[PDB]
Symmetry: D2
Subunit: 214 residues, 4 copies
């Protein structure tokens, strides 16, 4: 079980592990050891249709995610899940930042060329980072110095989430009303979910999924 | 599938598991031997339990409804149970379950009387079904020692809390037994975490004297 | 102040509530501070676009008396807090839901409905009698009680926020749920409407997935 | 009841359901002796029977820097609403540490100068943000250059048990100083509203240090 999808300039979503597959939901709904394709597919659709989503909780993913803090903050609002975020305490910290490409601004009619917007963002980021390093060099503790860093600082985290919670996540974030950056991560999550649970995923698209972009 | 028999007709069977002791080490370090084992200890020792949320089991449990009802109080877990609306076995305690208590009739007489009421209740239930009574109504006469089955999907942290509450002399003997089988499967799949849990975090009594 | 009798010896009683419809408006706006039409529109907007987090800031506590077969369906709702009666802090008592003949007319049976009631009552009586016999003999309660039927009444305190309550009404205030649980869910709905009228109507109009609360007043 | 924290922060009590007696009613499952009642509260707490305390609930209104809010929001057993432009006016303030914050640390650069550098960065980042907005960059993109010390506001609803778990993790000297201060304010309000429970918590269940010193 291993998949990686690159997101933004330096970000990613990688699959670390999975427990179960579409049949794990079939099994839990029946309380049985079944493994007959047709009737198992029908059952999955049937559960999805009638909003009987508990069986899908017995499918579980672990993801490793690299994303900017503004994205990670919205993400961590999903309470029915487990998070471990990068701290200095158990491994090395690094410092990269999401610089939007000029095409991110297309559609918006801006006073200055998109390339200049991109460059202004780079510049202010570079200044904050250099101030950060300055403070660290002077002996300011990391936990203080780091408050000058911008919301586009990349973080990394593991996320363990069951299929039901994942579908709820997709309903909120895989949507043209979500911020573009968020959507992009949600497409990656959907894509891995589709790979590992095609029947569940297709059933979710047909009957339960509330957004557009999938 | 590791499968452990409990009470007269019950069990705990392992359906699936995701990860192992290293799943917790990877998570704590956010990165895809004795060092890794030492990190587990260090985590458990300092109360940093979140890395263990990244290990997960699914169990198949057959238990008497009185035991299930206590078990289902553990909210940080997922359950799918057989429906009472849509087999019929009953936990009959052995005479030995009673020893330690002075009773005015002998233990084997207690066992017998339990069996008898179960028989009566079961037969009544069959008459009602036979008469057309729907099951969702007819079953309400069945006693709390009726066996049910369920799947249980639980992370290792929420599992250690469950072991904290149920693998302990102060819980009903019956659920201890189920908690011993759970401990046993946990220990098999996640030896380092399990030892570390006993040594630094486990608040109950029995697992420090009942092996596996 | 608010207690509703359910089944033959059951009830739903309201112990406490935090907040009202405006607790949800305040939370959506993140403002500790009133404009009825505008505030009602916000509640409709939240409910219509599926943003139900603001309703988590309204909370209820109930005291509920129900047969164990009902309680077990209820305790499957995990986004909530439960305190069930035990031998520890308070007195136990022993009562049972004996269904009336009406419960079964509608079903074609080969004995009269009253005969069903009579048979359920009998077996309850015998089970209970056996129980008290074992108790008098020294058998501890935790063992002796396993003979008692699933229609034994229990009590609990349930603390639940309005969002989680709405999910519960979705799943239980519905003709596909067992009739006994419908009846509890209708009492929970009535209270919830009395305290949070705006949220309860917006719920029905936009989010409610069941049948009965759209059929049956309060 | 409102407690000021950091330079522009606060914790304010919005609402509370119940008091010490709510846990006693719950434990006994009775809607129907002051000294008996405290004894039960100590008894519950010493034996780890903390479920009765779930029937006491608080709503807070908290103004805090994002770095703080991100650590706070990791407490999953609770309900949050964070300020959005969607339902209310947004504003732009930043946590500048006082020089006493560093006092304790041996720095190459005096504490007031650390304070000044943080302030300088904020001003520059904030001004870059404003330049972008003026240009026609949307807020959702422009705000990504803002530093982690930007204040945010949120409502937090949390039952007493979950609140005690929070105090265990954050009212402790190993927590970052800034969150400790919010944790002390939470604790004070807790103590005010639920004295018997708070007293019993310190005596039997509290795992931290600082609530026993202040
Ligand atoms: C941003 C956006 O507004 C949401 O806050 C965010 O996307 C997560 O919301 P959520 O509660 O659906 O996700 P989660 O917090 O993961 O919730 C997942 C599911 O659990 C339920 N849930 C979780 N916690 C609670 C709670 N305390 N009260 C009521 N329902 C809950 C939700 O209804 C949802 O269906
Ligand atoms: C029977 C016994 O009295 C308990 O009800 C049963 O063991 C479940 O206890 P629990 O809440 O610790 O388990 P669970 O319901 O699995 O909870 C386990 C852990 O999660 C926490 N938890 C889960 N839900 C809540 C909640 N709604 N409020 C506060 N804490 C919560 C508990 O503090 C505990 O440490
Ligand atoms: C009948 C049916 O079989 C269920 O047992 C019962 O309806 C419980 O439903 P529920 O999980 O929606 O309610 P609850 O268990 O109260 O759940 C309410 C909300 O919380 C969410 N939730 C709580 N725990 C989990 C979890 N472990 N995984 C995913 N979602 C969760 C659900 O998605 C749901 O929207
Ligand atoms: C920083 C620090 O590492 C934690 O991320 C932060 O303190 C969150 O703490 P918490 O999960 O204990 O609190 P919360 O996220 O509020 O959890 C409170 C309690 O509930 C339990 N809990 C909640 N969610 C889960 C879960 N998904 N799996 C297992 N246990 C859970 C924990 O045992 C804890 O005692």
């Amino acid at each position: 079980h291993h998949m990686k999808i690159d997101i933004l300039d330096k970000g990613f979503v990688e699959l670390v592990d999975v427990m179960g597959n579409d049949l794990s939901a079939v099994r839990a709904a029946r309380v049985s050891f079944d493994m007959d394709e047709e009737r198992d597919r029908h059952l999955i659709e049937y559960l999805m249709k009638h909003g009987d989503e508990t069986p899908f909780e017995h499918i579980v993913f672990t993801f490793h995610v690299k994303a900017p803090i503004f994205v990670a903050r919205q993400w961590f609002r999903h309470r029915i899940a487990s998070y471990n975020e990068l701290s200095g305490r158990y491994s090395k910290l690094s410092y990269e930042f999401y610089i939007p490409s000029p095409e991110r601004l297309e559609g918006y009619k801006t006073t200055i060329p998109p390339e200049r917007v991109t460059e202004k963002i780079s510049e202010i980021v570079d200044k904050a980072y250099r101030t950060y390093l300055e403070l660290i060099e002077s002996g300011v503790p990391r936990e203080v110095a780091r408050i000058v860093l911008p919301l586009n600082l990349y973080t990394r985290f593991f996320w363990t989430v069951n299929a039901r919670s994942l579908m709820n996540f997709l309903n909120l974030r895989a949507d043209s009303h979500a911020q573009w950056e968020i959507q992009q991560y949600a497409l990656a999550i959907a894509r891995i979910f589709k790979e590992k649970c095609p029947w569940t995923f297709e059933a979710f698209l047909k009957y339960a999924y509330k957004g557009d972009i999938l």
